[PDB]
Write a protein that binds this ligand. Structure first.
Ligand SMILES: CCCCCCCCCCCCCCCCCC(=O)OC[C@H](CO[C@@H]1O[C@H](CO[C@H]2O[C@H](CO)[C@H](O)[C@H](O)[C@H]2O)[C@H](O)[C@H](O)[C@H]1O)OC(=O)CCCCCCCCCCCCCCCCC
Ligand code: CLA
Ligand code: CLA
Ligand code: CLA
Ligand code: CLA
Ligand code: CLA
Ligand code: CLA
Ligand code: CLA
Ligand SMILES: CCCCCCCCCCCCCCCCCC(=O)OC[C@H](CO[C@@H]1O[C@H](CO)[C@H](O)[C@H](O)[C@H]1O)OC(=O)CCCCCCCCCCCCCCCCC
Ligand SMILES: CCCCCCCCCCCCO[C@@H]1O[C@H](CO)[C@@H](O[C@H]2O[C@H](CO)[C@@H](O)[C@H](O)[C@H]2O)[C@H](O)[C@H]1O
Ligand code: OEC
Ligand SMILES: [Cl-]
Ligand SMILES: [Fe+2]
Lengths: 447, 137, 50, 335, 82, 340
């Protein structure tokens, strides 16, 4: 049916731009690979998982995702039952076969097109209604999902809250922030130092709360699109074609890929340092903590200690007056964390609490996080590039953040590429300048 | 140029008596040393307090002496300060604090002897390297 | 006409002006030698060969 | 008036402008003028900047003892970190010039404009009926500036760690980088130099091959360039004679005969290679560094047998141990 | 577009080729393997075995210090059971 | 005459053109590549640099290398049958004889290859601008792998053949010669970086200014291997760049010569710079800068900063990088900042 007199081999999948049926097999077979991975990987992780040992020290990135949702963990992120892990893994692994079946089917047996074998499923790219409608369906499916989280947190068990009053623990959220002023407030937050935008969420109430809003707002728009057509501008602005739509979704993922990179790198809440490693700023803070704690025990007065530059070996002031840790760590004075908060006062680090309220669990927490900073090599050798082999480790936060920046990036290229093609495809010159009617040749010379 | 049993002969106790480890214990120790020490004691130093290293001489002038299997083993159960005038098991991994330092839970007396032996065998092989830091890398 | 970097090709087969140029070159090289010497003699200090 | 705004939009988008001020241009042209003007003034008269937040001002402007090679625009303070530092955030300009205020105003405006510059490289291509993707080639050099001016600082937690705006200031960025990340031993950087070396290589390849296989239409004493007229129908070189020669240099099937496949390769190679180098700096901005083969090969007794990988580590320690003299107070360099 | 040589494609596909190379290729492989595994390679290139970098006690390097009497000096380095 | 028959045979159009040049090229070119691949897996650098340098010892593709001879050898050609190795092969290997082997052989291999280009060009009847261009890579190899060490104490300070073994050559040049601050090196990079730009920019400009000569999207097939019309709109390209950059080509003959010039001129300059580094006649410092830095302790530029980095590189590397000097630098003499 389709061969070289369509597209070139290395552009094969573009021969499916107008074969709805087969183009469904791909998406159903593909969606299988994602489920397959998630499942097959979880079991791989668990197969190697050692209970009495930090998750971040075992190269896990899925089991800690489950742990966060309050599953198989307890006090301080202690692993209680590995069954929920095994379950989530096997379930997925199975569904991958189910999806995979349909994929293979729709791509090599079933109808090569849909329009006739059912007008409901068949579609036309330029059919502004079918598009807004299918989009509308998905906008609901995603919307229900957003609530599927709100349910698990409020009814079915909770989530892992590191900020837990009694110290990190699975907690049931029964008071989601629904106040729009607060919720949507985050979006009006700066993305720079301090005000951190979305990544600045620091409590489960907002998380759960925000998700309620999204769940609703999403399904609302899901119905709206089912029951409508793009307006006037909406039509005279965009390009309506199979590629153009892709592109739009490409730039969308890209952007989400960058946001994800910063979330796993900066956020403490939705990415617990107990399961992942300590955040970048958290580890550098911990060093200051560790040594202020040490030397203070040796009889040094941290409050008045003067370092080489005359700035304050252990404690100094931020640009706005607050008391912070000294050293190169002055750049991370925006770090907040369970272990360090009890030492903060209304003006920043309180010289009195620091002087006699430091608790042992904090001293060893700081030591732990200090010796587990997100520094490592490709071949997985934890530490600074000049370190020696022995401690095989690279923070999960480092792995996640890098992988997702690469992906996010290439996707922005993917966007540009498919968007540039769509605009040329539309207007109709994505295959060369018309030898005869060469546009430039009809324009006056600027010379 | 090899790890002869001559090199694996390290002091067992304070009263001069020695013990001879085997290439199996060594490797095993080395593995355990990575599992629960390297994190902070990579290459014989101490990241969270660079003033105290694992040099045999340093362990010799410790109090009590920790430059022998018996010593180091005791330490790994009930750790103390360099003068021994204070127990630090709360902020240092040890058997009496495995609840706080999970990595120490598995560890059995067999394992403790290996780790201790490793600490006394390394400087014998590496020499100055074991004690010092980046200067010797 | 001729590009700037080819102006001297005007001699490729004019033995006369080829000798005439080259004579000028030698003059410059001989000239430089003579005068570079004088520069050194006007600044060299013989007061101590050690 | 057919309608002012309607006209405005027709002028902006007009393909009859000497310089195509596009829609992206409307954002580009102003941002780039701010960046350049501030730069030029900074580089010449700006006062010392306390880059390391340790009250140890580094002067990098001409009027303050610098020359072209040493002079630079110094990065914002480390005390500021990633905080936004616009002029209206300072008690005075004096304070703003001391904390490296100019640096941010420049990097932000440049990166902004340089992006729209890409957006424009699409727009004009659209308005002229030519295929897009040219802007996609320019995505590689841009993605580097981004990596070096924004990605690395975000990752490292401060803009003071971004590459300075100067010759020597750049060498500093490199030497230190190498020490903290061992970049030479990282796959992405290697692909980068492959793309750059390769580029220059191929650039010489094509360049030579083509110019060497030009059809004669010029005199013996007339520039071989004149043998081409702007707006020709047929080709100006024998691409079949070129391939004939190059095919014999190596071997036939290892030679291009399709000008289109040739030129795609010519573009694909460097762009792909630089894309990876940019991803290298952007990846090592989260401390996923190059291979660490320190003390890998050891002998039968346990002795450490050095490799060239170790000799590199010493050179690295020197940089580490000496960079930012007075900025460190603790053992590990985690910032 | 052609020269005397028999088009690779044909050869890499000829059952004759494989009947030959199924023998030849692995032959060379097992040979080279043996070259290393029999310790011969170590002697052909004077390359030290894991237990021949230093003498038991010594921690010094056998650095060749003079050109003309180098070979002689090298031999002496092998003497101290290095 | 046999000669013309010998010729006849050589210049015969085969799959892999031999030619007169081949009599020099292939022997060397193969021995060079062979010697590397050999040493890379079998020969050690223990007796030469106190370094493991082959797979057989445990080195990987990055850490492997054919290291230079000892510093004792001096500039000795180190012939297998020379006073050093004395006909012995194993010794030759341990004395880094394989370096001068690869070096000297490969050197001739590059002569042969350019000659080939020259010879094949002549036959095919095309201009030798491929040969002129290849002078740049020669200059580099000659100046760096020969001229440079010839000015130093010995071959020992020439770049060792290997991946990592080249990275230290870079770091060395920074630390000791402050090479990055050299006007000629800069021109060098300007050519290579700028050359890798012309490559990319011209390629993309062509692919996106093509005429339509087919009905498919994959426009590759749509090309006429047998000349005729320009396959891309040279007229459109001109207008494009003339509006986005302000400047634009308009003479493919010049545009292509430029592409030869830029990277070849670049590499030539970077060579001159190294030829000077042989005599150690480097571009290390700026005197006006040093004098003010001496008298005034508060004067600090990104230049002064760099020099301190060099001091560290030299002090911390020199010991294991120059074994023959039996360096011993007590911990207290080692320059170091605070804490680190
Ligand atoms: C051509 C190719 C072009 C490629 C372009 C790629 C651009 C990628 C930029 C990422 C988008 C930023 C979105 C984001 O997630 O933005 C979030 C990030 C991160 O913000 C962080 O926000 C805060 C994080 O707090 C969190 O983290 C901890 C502190 O470490 C604490 O525990 C705290 O409790 C916790 O909430 C802190 O203030 C951090 O210092 C940091 O500022 O913003 C930043 O760094 C980004 C700085 C602003 C520049 C972005 C401009 C976008 C246009
Ligand atoms: C991307 C998802 C997807 C889509 C859009 C389709 C679409 C289609 N499939 Mg199908 N298929 C899929 C996945 C999908 N399939 C998978 C994973 C498999 C493997 C099991 C199959 C196996 C399959 C077969 C064997 C056949 C089809 C056929 C068809 C076509 C006829 C419609 C039909 O089967 O009605 C079915 C009737 C329904 C409308 C009822 C489905 C209700 C189910 C039971 C509930 C689903 C629950 C859901 C997961 C959760 C959503 C709820 C949430 C919103 C709250 C149609 C184009 C037929 C065809 O080729 O005809 C042309 C056909 O023979 N499919
Ligand atoms: C995400 C991965 C993916 C997917 C889902 C598809 C899917 C598809 N491609 Mg495709 N493609 C891909 C990657 C992918 N491609 C890549 C990377 C390339 C570049 C190499 C191509 C190049 C390419 C070309 C050049 C063409 C396609 C075509 C097609 C379509 C027809 C399938 C076909 O020809 O059957 C052929 C059937 C076989 C030879 C049998 C293959 C074996 C099956 C499919 C795998 C079984 C999976 C598993 C082992 C069994 C599970 C069973 C279990 C559930 C019980 C189909 C929609 C064609 C098209 O355009 O449609 C008309 C087409 O011409 N593709
Ligand atoms: C992208 C998301 C992602 C992330 C963040 C991770 C992260 C991690 N994985 Mg992982 N993994 C993933 C996807 C991911 N994986 C997938 C899709 C698979 C299926 C193949 C696996 C299979 C897998 C296994 C089997 C294992 C891990 C392990 C690990 C952990 C150790 C990391 C490692 O050692 O890296 C080292 C890997 C690299 C250095 C390879 C880099 C490859 C890059 C991307 C190539 C780029 C070249 C480029 C594409 C060329 C194209 C150019 C050309 C077109 C011109 C780490 C937490 C290990 C673990 O859990 O042990 C603790 C482990 O055993 N993973
Ligand atoms: C992700 C799923 C999704 C998708 C793909 C769409 C897609 C679409 N919607 Mg839509 N919609 C959704 C969800 C979605 N919607 C939801 C959940 C709701 C309920 C709130 C709506 C409510 C909605 C309405 C009420 C309308 C649409 C319309 C449209 C169409 C035109 C939109 C447009 O022109 O934007 C382009 C918009 C601009 C010109 C303004 C850009 C300014 C942006 C918003 C701010 C800058 C963005 C910035 C970079 C991000 C920073 C974050 C910020 C918070 C600081 C388009 C097909 C319109 C339509 O045609 O209806 C049929 C329309 O009237 N939608
Ligand atoms: C043995 C000495 C020598 C001689 C006699 C020639 C002679 C010639 N060369 Mg030439 N050439 C030489 C060495 C020499 N070259 C070297 C060493 C190189 C490599 C660097 C070249 C590279 C070269 C090229 C690339 C070309 C020639 C060309 C020519 C011919 C035209 C000359 C022309 O008009 O220049 C014009 C001269 C000027 C208007 C510009 C001179 C500007 C210089 C660079 C500034 C330095 C001036 C300074 C005083 C020089 C000090 C001398 C120093 C050696 C001590 C001419 C026959 C050209 C030719 O073939 O035309 C078809 C041509 O294209 N030569
Ligand atoms: C009347 C003849 C004459 C005499 C006697 C001298 C004498 C002298 N000149 Mg001189 N000179 C002359 C003409 C003369 N010059 C001319 C015409 C010029 C312009 C071209 C110069 C330009 C000149 C300069 C620029 C310099 C001198 C210098 C000197 C002095 C140093 C001599 C030196 O070491 O030479 C060195 C001799 C050689 C370069 C060796 C030449 C051998 C070549 C390499 C072989 C050529 C290849 C050959 C054809 C192969 C065939 C040989 C066959 C037998 C196998 C010396 C006093 C130097 C001085 O100190 O300043 C005052 C100096 O710098 N001269
Ligand atoms: C034709 C290509 C070629 C070339 C140019 C070279 C060149 C070289 N090889 Mg070589 N080599 C080649 C092929 C080639 N090789 C091949 C195919 C092999 C594998 C068998 C080798 C194996 C090899 C080894 C193992 C070594 C070299 C070495 C060398 C270098 C020094 C050797 C020397 O002193 O030559 C001397 C030059 C001659 C013998 C030419 C003499 C020609 C005249 C006309 C003949 C006169 C003969 C007559 C008896 C003399 C009468 C005079 C009377 C007074 C006695 C030199 C660069 C050595 C080296 O790399 O050291 C670092 C080295 O050890 N090569
Ligand atoms: C937005 C606008 C941004 C401004 C861009 C400014 C471009 C600089 C133009 C420089 C002059 C170019 C020129 O004279 O050649 C004008 C020529 C165009 O004219 C040529 O004329 C004929 C040659 O015989 C041919 O017809 C050629 O094809 C071409 O048309 O450009 C070239 O051919 C050479 C290409 C390389 C151009 C130089 C790149 C610019 C790099 C500048 C770096 C210096 C920065 C210093 C910082 C202090
Ligand atoms: C073009 C020029 C190409 C020259 C290639 C020469 C290659 C052979 O080079 C030749 O190698 C043999 C060893 O195999 C050496 O022979 C050496 O070792 C053998 C033992 O193996 C001794 O008996 C002999 O006394 C000694 O000289 C020769 O001294 C050397 O000249
Ligand atoms: Mn400039 Ca990166 Mn050096 Mn730790 Mn701050
Ligand atoms: Cl510095
Ligand atoms: Fe071209």
């Amino acid at each position: 049916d389709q061969e070289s007199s369509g597209f070139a081999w290395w552009a094969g999948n573009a021969r499916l731009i107008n074969l709805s049926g087969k183009l469904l097999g791909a998406h159903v077979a593909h969606a299988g690979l994602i489920v397959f991975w998630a499942g097959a990987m979880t079991l791989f992780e668990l197969a190697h998982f050692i209970p009495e040992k930090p998750m971040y020290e075992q190269g896990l990135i899925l089991i800690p995702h489950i742990a966060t949702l309050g599953w198989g963990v307890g006090p301080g992120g202690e692993v209680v039952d590995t069954f929920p892990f095994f379950v989530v893994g096997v379930v997925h692994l199975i569904s991958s076969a189910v999806l995979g079946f349909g994929g293979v089917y729709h791509a090599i047996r079933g109808p090569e097109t849909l329009e006739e074998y059912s007008s409901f499923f068949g579609y036309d790219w330029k059919d502004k209604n079918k598009m807004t409608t299918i989009l509308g369906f998905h906008l609901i499916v995603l919307g229900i999902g957003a609530l599927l989280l709100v349910a698990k947190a409020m009814f079915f068990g909770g989530l892992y809250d590191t900020w837990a009053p009694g110290g990190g623990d699975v907690r049931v959220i029964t008071n989601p922030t629904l106040d729009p002023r607060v919720i949507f407030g985050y979006l009006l937050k700066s993305p720079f130092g301090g005000e951190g935008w979305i990544v600045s969420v620091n409590n489960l109430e907002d998380v759960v709360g925000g998700h309620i809003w999204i769940g609703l707002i999403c399904i609302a728009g899901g119905i709206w699109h089912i029951l409508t057509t793009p307006f006037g501008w909406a039509r005279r602005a965009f390009i309506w074609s199979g590629e153009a739509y892709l592109s739009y979704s490409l730039g969308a993922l890209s952007m989400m890929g960058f946001i994800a990179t910063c979330f796993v790198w900066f956020n403490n809440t939705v990415y617990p340092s107990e399961f992942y490693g300590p955040t970048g700023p958290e580890a550098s803070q911990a060093q200051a903590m560790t040594f202020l704690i040490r030397d203070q025990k040796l009889g040094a007065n941290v409050g008045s200690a003067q370092g080489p530059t005359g700035l304050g070996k252990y404690l100094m002031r931020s640009p706005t007056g607050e008391i912070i840790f000294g050293g190169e760590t002055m750049r991370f004075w925006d770090f907040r964390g369970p272990w360090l908060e009890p030492l903060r006062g209304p003006n920043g680090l309180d010289l009195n609490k620091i002087k006699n309220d430091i608790q042992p669990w904090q001293e060893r927490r700081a030591a732990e996080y200090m010796t587990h900073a997100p520094l490592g090599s490709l071949n997985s050798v934890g530490g600074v590039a000049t370190e020696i082999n022995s401690v095989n480790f690279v923070s999960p936060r480092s792995w996640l953040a890098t992988s997702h920046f690469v992906l996010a990036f290439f996707f922005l290229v993917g966007h540009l590429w498919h968007a540039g093609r769509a605009r040329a495809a539309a207007a109709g010159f994505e295959k060369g300048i018309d030898r005869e009617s060469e546009p430039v040749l009809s324009m006056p010379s600027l010379d | 140029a090899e790890l002869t049993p001559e090199v694996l002969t390290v002091p067992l106790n304070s009263e001069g008596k020695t013990i001879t480890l085997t290439e199996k214990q060594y490797l095993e120790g080395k593995r355990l040393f990575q599992y629960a020490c390297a994190s902070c004691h990579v290459g014989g130093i101490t990241k969270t307090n660079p003033s105290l290293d694992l040099r045999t001489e340093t362990l010799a002038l410790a109090t009590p002496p920790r430059d022998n299997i018996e010593g180091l083993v005791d330490y790994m159960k009930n750790p103390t300060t360099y003068d021994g005038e204070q127990e630090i098991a709360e902020v240092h991994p040890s058997l009496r604090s495995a609840d706080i330092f999970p990595k120490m839970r598995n560890l059995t007396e067999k394992d403790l002897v290996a780790i201790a032996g490793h600490i006394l065998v390394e400087p014998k092989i590496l020499g100055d390297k074991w004690g010092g830091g980046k200067v010797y890398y | 006409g001729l590009p700037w970097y080819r102006v001297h090709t005007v001699l490729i087969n004019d033995p006369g002006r080829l000798i005439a140029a080259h004579l000028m070159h030698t003059a410059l090289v001989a000239g430089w030698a003579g005068s570079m010497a004088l520069y050194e003699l006007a600044t060299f200090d013989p007061s101590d060969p050690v | 008036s057919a309608n002012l705004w309607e006209r405005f939009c027709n002028w902006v988008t007009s393909t009859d402008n000497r310089l195509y001020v596009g829609w992206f241009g409307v954002i580009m042209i102003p941002t780039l003028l701010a960046a350049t003007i501030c730069f030029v003034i900074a580089f010449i008269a700006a006062p010392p900047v306390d880059i390391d937040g340790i009250r140890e001002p580094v002067s990098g402007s001409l009027l303050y003892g610098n020359n072209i090679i040493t002079g630079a625009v110094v990065p914002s303070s480390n005390a500021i970190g990633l905080h936004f530092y616009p002029i209206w955030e300072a008690a005075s300009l004096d304070e703003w010039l001391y904390n490296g205020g100019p640096y941010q105003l420049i990097i932000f405006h440049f990166l902004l404009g340089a992006s729209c510059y890409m957006g424009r490289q699409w727009e004009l291509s659209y308005r002229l009926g030519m295929r897009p993707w040219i802007c996609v080639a320019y995505s590689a050099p841009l993605a580097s500036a981004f990596a070096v001016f924004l990605i690395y600082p975000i990752g490292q937690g401060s803009f003071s760690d971004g590459m300075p705006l100067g010759i020597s200031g750049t060498f500093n960025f490199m030497i230190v980088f190498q020490a903290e990340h061992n970049i030479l031993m990282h796959p992405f950087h290697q692909l980068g130099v492959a793309g750059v070396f390769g580029g220059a290589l191929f650039c010489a390849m094509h360049g030579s091959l083509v110019t060497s296989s030009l059809i004669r239409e010029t005199t013996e004493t007339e520039s071989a360039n004149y043998g081409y007229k702007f707006g020709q129908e047929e080709e100006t070189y024998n691409i079949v004679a070129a391939h004939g020669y190059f095919g014999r240099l190596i071997f036939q099937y290892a030679s291009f005969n399709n000008s289109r496949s040739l030129h795609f390769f010519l573009a694909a190679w460097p762009v792909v290679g630089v894309w990876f180098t940019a991803l290298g700096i952007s990846t090592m901005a989260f401390n996923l560094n190059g291979f660490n083969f320190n003390h890998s090969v050891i002998d039968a007794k346990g002795n450490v047998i050095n490799t060239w990988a170790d000799i590199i580590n010493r050179a690295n320690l020197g940089m580490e141990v000496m960079h930012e003299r007075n900025a460190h107070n603790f053992p590990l360099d985690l910032a | 577009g052609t020269t005397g040589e028999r088009p690779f494609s044909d050869i890499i596909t000829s059952v004759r080729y494989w009947v030959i190379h199924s023998i030849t290729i692995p032959a060379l492989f097992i040979a080279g393997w043996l070259f290393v595994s029999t310790g011969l390679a170590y002697d052909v290139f004077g390359t030290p075995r894991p237990d021949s970098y230093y003498a038991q006690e010594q921690r010094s390097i056998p650095l060749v210090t003079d050109r003309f009497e180098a070979k002689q000096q090298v031999e002496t380095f092998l003497e101290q059971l290095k | 005459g046999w000669f013309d028959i010998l010729d006849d045979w050589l210049k015969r159009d085969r799959f892999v053109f031999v030619g007169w040049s081949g009599i020099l090229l292939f022997p060397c070119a193969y021995l060079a590549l062979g010697g590397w691949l050999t040493g890379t897996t079998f020969v050690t650098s223990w007796y030469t640099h106190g370094l493991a340098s082959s797979y057989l010892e445990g080195c990987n593709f990055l850490t492997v290398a054919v290291s230079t001879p000892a510093n004792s050898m001096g500039h000795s050609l180190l012939l297998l049958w020379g006073p050093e190795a004395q006909g012995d092969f194993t010794r030759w290997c341990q004395l880094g004889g394989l370096w001068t082997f690869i070096a000297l052989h490969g050197a001739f291999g590059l002569i042969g290859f350019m000659l080939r280009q020259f010879e094949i060009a002549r036959l095919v009847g095309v201009r030798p601008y491929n040969a002129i261009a290849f002078s740049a890579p020669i200059a580099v190899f000659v100046s760096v792998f020969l001229i440079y060490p010839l000015g130093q104490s010995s071959w020992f300070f020439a770049p060792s053949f290997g991946v990592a073994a080249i990275f230290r050559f870079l770091l060395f040049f920074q630390g000791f010669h402050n090479w990055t601050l050299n006007p000629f090196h800069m021109m060098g990079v300007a050519g290579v970086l700028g050359g890798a730009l012309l490559c990319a920019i011209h390629g993309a400009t062509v692919e996106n200014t093509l005429f339509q000569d087919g009905e498919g999207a994959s426009t590759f097939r749509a090309f006429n291997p047998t000349q005729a019309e320009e396959t891309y709109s040279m007229v459109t390209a001109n207008r494009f760049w003339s509006q986005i950059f302000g400047i634009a080509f308009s003479n493919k003959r010049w545009l292509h010569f430029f592409m030869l010039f830029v990277p070849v001129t670049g590499l030539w300059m970077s060579a001159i710079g190294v030829v000077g580094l042989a005599l150690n006649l480097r571009s290390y410092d700026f005197i006006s800068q040093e004098i003010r830095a001496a008298e005034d302790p508060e004067f600090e530029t990104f230049y002064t900063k760099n020099l301190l980095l060099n001091e560290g590189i030299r002090a911390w590397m020199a010991p294991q990088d120059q074994p023959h000097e039996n360096f011993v630098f007590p911990e207290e003499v080692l320059p170091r900042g605070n804490a680190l």
